[PDB]
RNA sequence: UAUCUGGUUGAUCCUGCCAGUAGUCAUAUGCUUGUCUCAAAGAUUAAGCCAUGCAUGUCUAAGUAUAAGCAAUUUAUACAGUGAAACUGCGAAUGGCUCAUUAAAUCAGUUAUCGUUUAUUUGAUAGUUCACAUGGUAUAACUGUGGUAAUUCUAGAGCUAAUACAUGCUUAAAAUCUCGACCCUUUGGAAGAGAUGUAUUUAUUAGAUAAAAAAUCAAUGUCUUCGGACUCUUUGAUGAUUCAUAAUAACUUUUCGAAUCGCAUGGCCUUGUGCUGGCGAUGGUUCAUUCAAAUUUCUGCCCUAUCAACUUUCGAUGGUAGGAUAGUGGCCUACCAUGGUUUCAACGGGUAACGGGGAAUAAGGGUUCGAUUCCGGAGAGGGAGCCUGAGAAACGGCUACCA
RNA sequence: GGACUUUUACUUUGAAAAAAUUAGAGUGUUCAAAGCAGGCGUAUUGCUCGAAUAUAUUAGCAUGGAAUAAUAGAAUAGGACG
RNA sequence: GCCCGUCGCUAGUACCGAUUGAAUGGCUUAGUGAGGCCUCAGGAUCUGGCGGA
């Protein structure tokens, strides 16, 4: 059962040490590496399943490939995604265009869709309204704040020089 | 890892073990009292001999010094509030002689 | 030790914080925040131990989720929060408001305090300079920054703060004879106006403080924190007003309250 | 020391920052930089007057001196830009209630702005380690 | 890996201590970086509490700034000649701090023709004003004019390369100049 | 709580050891054993070896739900309840256990950072970035076809998520510098062209103050009463700095500067899907605080000379420069020098040695013990190496060698 | 703030000072070893005292003392004040 | 009377002793040298004219 690594040029066995995002390693903690087996990618006579994908069909339809068709299991949950799996403008409400999956639980022939992401909603708007806002707020709040400490001093003055003026 | 729950013992014992005078009185004062064994008069000479060494430690003291007189006239009082040393002779001089 | 220690096992925790000695094998370990751990006190001590609000921890927490609880301000939910000395603890439920303030053995005493004075609070400057784009800032006791404070405001002198918002109003100097409080040794607690600093060029300056029995005492300049004029000061002091009675002195009042 | 060898190194010697400018006219040659480390340490006018560049020296380098300030007899000039001194003290025995007299050689920088010699007593201050031994710079010459 | 400890490096009175407390990350210390010139490549490296460090290989063009004239251009490194650590560094013409080294110095003449113009080595209204507002100010050195001609000045770097990416320096100017010019010519 | 007694002689007084005697938070063992409370306990020998099971996981209104999931209710035909699996985040560096190594080490009291790192908590802090009605795929879980005796093994194929991954707009004024098309020759000044957030790197400058004043060379700033004068002018901290902070010319495979989420939803007309706007959550730079860490000053260890000289082979002591570090430092390298400890016991050896708070023994002075409930250190069969990270040279993490 | 200070030992007082331990106060765990509780009314909706003190002692810090015991000072005057 | 030494029997302890004797731990020369980390290359693919992984 040992499963083939592409890039090793090697019709045998090996073991080396694999790491996040590798092949034939699924890690078990952070930064966890562990040394696993792995067969060459040059096929040989010991291999027991060789797995091979179309590139181009023949002349006779196959068994049960050419001529079923599975459907992808989901669809596109993201606004912009939905938008260009349609091929949809930027304008068409797509929420409309977000297809259902019906569904039945006896006679409760539901309707349930994903909750598409990344949308454009007035409370989205609101927050970013809110947000460019508040930061202009502050920016002069601490500008005038900042006036009222520089006339403190410049009044202080006042007495570093009444007291100079006065002695 | 938890507290020490702390612990301690309430009865010393005589040095000479077979001193017949110090036994015969003993072997009395258990058979007047009531005592069942005689470490229960070992264990009240313990506690004698630790309050007469903690009063006369303070006797050497400067007389009135501040900690002499408030832990004396503390013994003093916890001595009378239970009954054995004479409400005369409530200046310690006599506790050694309790 | 590899890292962070997040247990207190007994007999490590403060003394000061009154905790029995068998009541299982831990204490709770103060959080990280405006006080020191070692000069602090937490939530579940003050209202398990002092108060006598909760029974048990697992209460405690149920309590503060109410928000029912605010220190200084916001509600503040963590059961091991840090409250340490000056702070203001309010209760939405009781209409009790308490000031965090030592007796004169040393511990935190429970002090209840008027609505009034609830709004305000002290502080000792314990720091000091220019910062940011030149803005001067002053850090102190309590472990809160203020911009833009008085050009007279020194080091280690205490300053009065508003609570509903940010800025200090007045700002008590550290100058021969100004009420202190001593925060520091078992010397802490004792209060007594000033008496005059030795400076000791390199560290250490010591603190001179006569309280007002005519009785004198030293102490280490982090340890004192000015708390205004003789006789005059700026919070209500605890019962006893920190005059270290002797333990004859205690003992013969405490014989005084004879008859019930 | 330094011994009147001003640019010995193979490296050029020089303050860091402390620029002098060749188009100006100028009647030092060399902007000095210098500083009074406190405690009541004058900074000696050698120090000040001197052509030597010392990076460890308390006046014109760049060290600090805080933490202890100790007193001993210099033992050994015979490392270069280093003394080793020996503190004496004597220690108490408790049980036979009397005094043993023991000692300890702490090595110490010298800045050339002080020429010693051995058997002077000596003021050294502690500083940040500059040396696997050194944690102590010589700041005043009491003999 | 590498140590900064002192538990091996025996005593000042020369005694042997024993192996305590085996090495700790804290006590770490990594390999040099040996930056050398030309095609720009820097790896990141997660220094203590993230804080990465830009440890620079193969550093071509770096800031250096005329100090007698306050001034900072980015010029190509061209070679190193001198290194008071070790002659090897030289002699690979490696980048390291406090290293000796030529540079292309066509913008520092660039700014000086647009700056007073004098036509250093061997006409608009308001550009004449400030030309002449400037002049007294334009003769240098009998030692730095001559080097534009070789058309590389001698300048010094002042950053830590292996530690910072970036690989700046200072043109060479007074008795600073003079020490290295008599350590060049003497020694070769 | 300041005590002695039996044994050398035919008898005697001594010296003197033996034996007697009392206690041990001192182990074992023998015999005996009814009650209350209290309740240590595989340290010693073997830090020797271990079957099995368990000892680290974790979700709030508030990152991600199209379970072909339960529940059906309920304004909800984008999502809306409840929620496995899976991602994301955080934690797994605390705890607990043991005393092997360790003798100037650890540890203790006292110091230092003007000598550094610091998740978090807490307090402050960002108008500046040149499709905004909001930009990009590439993946788990899932579906399905598979391999292997065998494990928390996983392959090929087909989908889809975001506070994951990767990006990329924005905002007033103001002032100061640079160039400067023209015009006119004088004392010279102008339309307008850019530049200027923070963070990194470098060079320069400010950062005054020990009591008072002038002349002049090079530039050159406001006010002209066109000889001229230049006018009171500002300053933070420490004992202590090149400090805090600031300015100037540039540098950067360019850090940060909210494309995030919940509960409500309202004003306000010039009715634009216009403009607005409430509470609080996650984040985010920089400073501060707190929890820390790392080094660090002074002084103190048991026996040993049948250990007197020791330290540089192959750093031993110092200097310079660099490199490396979070940062100081022979920490490491290059060059140079010849230093450094010692009868006041170095150096070496031993230890049935972790250090300390402390325990036992009660005239006092001492003697003896501490593996062990608290603090500190070290380790996880012996070594070394390292990934993740704020923090580990981690071991209920990985890699290699030995057993 | 400036200018300058012969060095030590000893002794006083004080600060700094973890808890448990220990010495020790209070409190009647039915006693006691212990524990830091507890004690009071209107026991109907509360009143109230606590959780001491001591102890570190070698070294470092701070302070008073000037006996005891050291060190240095003016002799080729290269002395002291001005 | 006391008393000394060789000689002889039993038992025990330690010493000297061919075996260049044996064993257990701590270092360490010389030689060989795993592994991870850093680095010069590499380029299964995988995508951004000339760069990235
Ligand atoms: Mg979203
Ligand atoms: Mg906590
Ligand atoms: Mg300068
Ligand atoms: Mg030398
Ligand atoms: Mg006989
Ligand atoms: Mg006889
Ligand atoms: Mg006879
Ligand atoms: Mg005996
Ligand atoms: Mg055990
Ligand atoms: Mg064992
Ligand atoms: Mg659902
Ligand atoms: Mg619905
Ligand atoms: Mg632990
Ligand atoms: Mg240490
Ligand atoms: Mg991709
Ligand atoms: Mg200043
Ligand atoms: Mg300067
Ligand atoms: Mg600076
Ligand atoms: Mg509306
Ligand atoms: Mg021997
Ligand atoms: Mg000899
Ligand atoms: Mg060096
Ligand atoms: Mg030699
Ligand atoms: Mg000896
Ligand atoms: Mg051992
Ligand atoms: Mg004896
Ligand atoms: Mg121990
Ligand atoms: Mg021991
Ligand atoms: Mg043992
Ligand atoms: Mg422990
Ligand atoms: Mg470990
Ligand atoms: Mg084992
Ligand atoms: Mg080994
Ligand atoms: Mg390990
Ligand atoms: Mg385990
Ligand atoms: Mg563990
Ligand atoms: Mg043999
Ligand atoms: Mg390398």
Same mark, same amino acid.
């Not at chain 3, 404070?149 to 080091?155: G, L, R, W």
């Given at each position: 059962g040992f499963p083939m690594k592409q890039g090793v040029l090697l019709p045998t066995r090996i073991k080396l040490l694999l790491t996040k995002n590798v092949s034939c390693y699924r890690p078990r903690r952070d930064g966890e590496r562990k040394r696993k087996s792995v067969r060459g990618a040059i096929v040989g006579p010991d291999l027991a399943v060789l797995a091979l994908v179309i590139v181009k069909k023949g002349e006779q339809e196959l068994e049960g490939l050419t001529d079923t068709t599975v459907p992808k299991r989901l669809g596109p949950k993201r606004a912009n995604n939905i938008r260009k799996f349609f091929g949809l403008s930027k304008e068409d409400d797509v929420r409309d265009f977000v297809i259902r999956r019906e569904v039945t639980k006896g006679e409760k022939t539901y309707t349930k869709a994903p909750k598409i992401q990344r949308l454009v909603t007035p409370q989205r708007l609101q927050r970013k309204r809110h947000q460019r806002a508040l930061k202009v707020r502050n920016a002069q709040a601490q500008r005038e704040a900042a006036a009222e400490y520089a006339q403190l001093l410049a009044k202080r003055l006042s007495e570093r020089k009444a007291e100079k003026a006065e002695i | 890892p938890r507290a020490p729950r702390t612990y301690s013992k309430t009865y010393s014992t005589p040095k000479? $073990?077979?001193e017949s005078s110090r036994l015969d009185a003993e072997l009395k004062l258990a058979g007047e009292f009531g005592l069942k064994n005689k470490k229960e008069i070992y264990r009240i000479s313990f506690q004698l001999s630790k309050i007469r060494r903690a009063a006369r430690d303070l006797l050497t003291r400067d007389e009135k010094d501040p900690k002499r007189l408030f832990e004396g006239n503390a013994l003093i009082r916890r001595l009378v509030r239970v009954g054995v040393l004479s409400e005369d002779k409530k200046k310690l001089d006599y506790v050694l002689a309790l | 030790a590899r890292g962070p220690k997040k247990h207190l096992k007994r007999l490590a925790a403060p003394h000061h914080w009154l905790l029995d000695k068998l009541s299982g094998c831990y204490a709770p370990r103060p959080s990280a925040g405006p006080h020191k751990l070692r000069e602090s006190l937490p939530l579940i001590v003050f209202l398990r131990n002092r108060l006598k609000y909760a029974l048990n921890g697992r209460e405690v927490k149920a309590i503060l989720m109410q928000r029912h609880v605010k220190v200084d301000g916001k509600v503040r939910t963590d059961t091991t929060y840090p409250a340490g000395f000056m702070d203001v603890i309010t209760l939405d439920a009781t209409n009790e408001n308490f000031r965090l303030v030592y007796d004169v053995k040393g511990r935190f005493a429970v002090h209840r305090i008027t609505d009034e004075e609830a709004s305000y609070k002290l502080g000792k400057v314990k720091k000091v300079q220019l910062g940011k784009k030149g803005v001067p800032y002053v850090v102190t006791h309590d472990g809160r920054t203020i911009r833009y $404070?008085? $050009?007279?405001?020194?080091?280690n002198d205490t300053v009065k703060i508003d609570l509903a918002s940010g800025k200090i109003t007045d700002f008590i100097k550290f100058d021969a004879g100004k009420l202190v409080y001593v925060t520091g040794g078992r010397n802490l607690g004792r209060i007594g106006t000033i008496v005059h600093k030795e400076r000791h060029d390199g560290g250490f300056d010591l603190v001179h403080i006569k309280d007002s029995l005519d009785n004198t005492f030293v102490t280490r300049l982090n340890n004192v924190f000015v708390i205004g004029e003789q006789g005059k000061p700026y919070i209500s002091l605890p019962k006893g007003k920190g005059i270290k009675l002797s333990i004859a002195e205690e003992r013969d009042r405490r014989r005084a309250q004879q008859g019930l | 020391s330094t011994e009147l060898t001003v640019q010995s190194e193979r490296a050029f010697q020089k303050q860091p920052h402390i620029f002098n400018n060749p188009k100006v006219k100028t009647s030092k040659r060399t902007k000095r930089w210098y500083k009074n480390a406190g405690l009541g340490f004058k900074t000696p006018k050698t120090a000040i007057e001197g052509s030597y560049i010392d990076k460890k020296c308390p006046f014109t380098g760049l060290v600090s001196i805080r933490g202890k300030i100790l007193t001993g007899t210099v033992v050994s000039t015979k490392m270069h830009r280093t003394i080793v001194i020996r503190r004496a003290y004597l220690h108490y025995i408790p049980k036979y209630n009397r005094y043993e007299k023991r000692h300890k050689n702490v090595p110490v920088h010298v800045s050339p702005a002080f020429r010693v010699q051995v058997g002077d007593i000596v003021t050294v201050g502690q500083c940040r380690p500059i040396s696997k031994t050194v944690r102590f710079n010589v700041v005043k010459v009491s003999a | 890996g590498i140590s900064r400890d002192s538990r091996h490096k025996r005593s000042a009175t020369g005694a042997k201590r024993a192996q305590f407390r085996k090495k700790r990350k804290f006590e770490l210390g990594r390999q040099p970086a040996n930056t050398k010139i030309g095609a720009k490549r820097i790896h990141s490296v997660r220094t203590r509490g993230g804080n990465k460090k830009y440890r620079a290989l193969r550093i071509e063009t770096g800031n250096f700034s005329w100090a007698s004239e306050g001034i900072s251009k980015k010029t190509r490194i061209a070679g190193v000649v001198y290194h008071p650590s070790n002659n090897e560094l030289v002699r690979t013409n490696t980048l390291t701090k406090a290293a000796i080294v030529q540079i292309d110095a066509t913008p520092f003449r660039q700014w000086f023709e647009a700056h007073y113009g004098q036509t250093l080595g061997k006409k608009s209204k308001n550009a004449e004003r400030k030309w002449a507002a400037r002049a007294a100010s334009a003769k240098i050195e009998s030692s730095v004019e001559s080097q534009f001609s070789a058309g590389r000045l001698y300048a010094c770097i002042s950053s830590r390369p292996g530690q910072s990416g970036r690989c700046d320096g200072y043109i060479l100017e007074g008795e600073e100049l003079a020490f290295y010019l008599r350590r060049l010519t003497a020694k070769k």
């Open positions: - | 000479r $073990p077979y | $404070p008085d $050009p007279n405001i020194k080091v | - | -």
